[PDB]
Amino acid sequence: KVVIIGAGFAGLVAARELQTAGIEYEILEAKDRIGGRAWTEERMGRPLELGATWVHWFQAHTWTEIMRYGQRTEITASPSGNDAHWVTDGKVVKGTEDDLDEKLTAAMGVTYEGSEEYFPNPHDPLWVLSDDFDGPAEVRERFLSDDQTNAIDLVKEAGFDQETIDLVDAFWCAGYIGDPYTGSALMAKQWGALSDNRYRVMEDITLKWKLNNGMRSLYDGIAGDLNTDIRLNTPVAKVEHVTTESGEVIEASAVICTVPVGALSNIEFSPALPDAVQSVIDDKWNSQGAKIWIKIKGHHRFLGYAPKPAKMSVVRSEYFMDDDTTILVGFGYDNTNIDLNSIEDAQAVINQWRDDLEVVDTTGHNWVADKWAGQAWGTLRKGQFTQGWSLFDIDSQLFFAGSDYAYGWRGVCVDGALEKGMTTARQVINSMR
Numbered sequence: 001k002v003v004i005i006g007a008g009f010a011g012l013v014a015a016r017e018l019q020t021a022g023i024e025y026e027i028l029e030a031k032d033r034i035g036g037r038a039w040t041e042e043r044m045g046r047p048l049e050l051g052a053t054w055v056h057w058f059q060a061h062t063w064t065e066i067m068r069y070g071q072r073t074e075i076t077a078s079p080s081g082n083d084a085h086w087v088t089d090g091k092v093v094k095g096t097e098d099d100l101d102e103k104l105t106a107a108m109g110v111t112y113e114g115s116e117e118y119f120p121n122p123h124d125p126l127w128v129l130s131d132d133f134d135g136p137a138e139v140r141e142r143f144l145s146d147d148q149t150n151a152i153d154l155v156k157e158a159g160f161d162q163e164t165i166d167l168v169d170a171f172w173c174a175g176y177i178g179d180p181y182t183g184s185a186l187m188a189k190q191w192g193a194l195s196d197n198r199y200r201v202m203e204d205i206t207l208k209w210k211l212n213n214g215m216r217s218l219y220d221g222i223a224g225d226l227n228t229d230i231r232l233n234t235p236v237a238k239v240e241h242v243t244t245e246s247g248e249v250i251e252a253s254a255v256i257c258t259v260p261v262g263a264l265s266n267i268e269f270s271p272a273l274p275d276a277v278q279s280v281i282d283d284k285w286n287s288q289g290a291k292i293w294i295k296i297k298g299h300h301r302f303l304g305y306a307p308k309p310a311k312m313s314v315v316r317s318e319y320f321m322d323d324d325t326t327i328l329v330g331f332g333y334d335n336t337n338i339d340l341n342s343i344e345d346a347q348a349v350i351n352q353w354r355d356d357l358e359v360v361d362t363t364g365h366n367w368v369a370d371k372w373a374g375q376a377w378g379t380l381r382k383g384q385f386t387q388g389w390s391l392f393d394i395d396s397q398l399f400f401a402g403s404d405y406a407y408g409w410r411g412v413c414v415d416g417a418l419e420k421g422m423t424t425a426r427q428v429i430n431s432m433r
């Protein structure tokens with residue numbers, strides 16, 4: 001009687017929540033598999049996360065799932081102490097990972113500068129704009145002005161040298177997973193608030209701990225608790241507010257739609273979504289990048305930073321294989337400028353820093369070109385912190401759930417999908433009671 005569109009983390013956790021309350025539900029999933037933009041698959045001789053990878057106990061919703069399904073001790077840290085290379089004035093500089101981290105730390109300190117006034121409760125991201133904001137008017141003005149500023153311009157205005165600008169350029173090409181110069185700096189500021197305003201805490205939370213048994217141990221865990229079957233290979237095309245696809249029509253008390261913004265053009269809504277919501281769909285988010293896995297010869301502890309418009313902006317060693325090869329991960333700002341499955345393209349990526357390392361394999365999934373995704377992880381363009389993700393939360397019987405609409409670790413983390421799927425389910429339960 002409640003229809004859930006999509007079998008990613010948001011949809012799966014909503015279903016389990018409905019089940020506990022005794023409410024009948026049904027999940028419709030377009031693809032042949034569950035998990036969505038989290039996807040654990042064997043490639044290049046080992047389980048690889050083609051989507052989501054990193055977790056942390058400071059992420060309440062992800063961590064409780066880790067505990068529920070037996071993964072408490074099944075996490076391992078990405079390797080550290082890599083030889084670092086970064087591109088700055090068209091040239092390559094070699095240093096240690098702590099040289100890079102200390103430069104990033106100082107720049108992040110300046111990047112976070114208003115978060116304590118904006119986010120005393122970092123899970124109340126729009127407090128500054130609410131009727132109960134008790135602070136000074138200048139705080140609200142700087143808040144709105146920061147939504148129209150990108151994170152790199154904050155560091156330029158503070159007078160860092162060109163080297164640090166190129167480092168934060170590289171950093172945010174990965175962070176925004178797209179063009180950082182069109183992004184809203186408020187996204188970076190909330191990440192700080194959620195990480196006690198320290199760069200190393202932010203990095204431990206988002207880029208350190210990997211699941212030994214992969215994201216699939218969590219999403220197969222949730223699906224395994226479900227008492228109703230998931231309808232795979234059942235894309236939705238219309239929703240009225242209940243509608244349907246390929247002729248089959250569904251009736252239901254309510255609809256929980258977890259389809260990402262980048263793929264909402266495949267569904268017709270009747271009545272049409274409000275103008276401000278539709279303008280986000282047309283403008284979507286800031287997530288046009290791509291994630292690659294590259295295998296090279298030998299065992300090498302490697303870290304590489306390169307600014308826009310490089311094919312990949314952050315590349316790091318992750319696994320040391322038993323046949324004397326290394327698997328590195330990389331993040332790049334523009335999916336249309338790299339073939340993730342072309343060994344030549346992967347060799348061109350490594351050649352950004354070194355001429356002596358040899359690519360032997362490469363793989364990835366281009367989430368942006370994926371018809372049922374149309375983006376990577378959700379990130380914010382200028383203006384979308386205050387007029388973006390919050391427009392989706394109208395539709396008395398239609399609900400938007402998903403990591404891209406979360407209050408906390410929005411878009412970039414499974415924690416946001418687990419948060420928003422569960423609370424949307426509670427919205428449905430409360431209204432029915």
Ligand SMILES: Cc1cc2nc3c(=O)[nH]c(=O)nc-3n(C[C@H](O)[C@H](O)[C@H](O)COP(=O)(O)OP(=O)(O)OC[C@H]3O[C@@H](n4cnc5c(N)ncnc54)[C@H](O)[C@@H]3O)c2cc1C
Nearest residue numbers: 006008009010030036037052053054236376402403413414
């Ligand atoms: C490259 C990349 C790396 C990431 N790394 C991390 C990481 O290290 N750590 C972390 O915490 N998070 C990470 N994430 C983010 C995390 O994967 C997501 O935030 C989360 O999985 C999103 O969950 P969701 O349920 O909201 O969306 P989705 O997983 O996108 O779920 C939506 C579902 O709806 C389906 N669907 C789409 N259209 C239709 C339709 N018309 N009809 C029916 N079904 C449809 C889709 O196939 C999908 O199954 C990463 C994301 C990406 C892209």
Ligand SMILES: NC[C@@H](O)c1ccc(O)cc1
Nearest residue numbers: 171174175206207331412
């Ligand atoms: N999905 C990884 C995401 O956590 C991320 C990736 C790169 C960064 O520089 C910051 C955050």
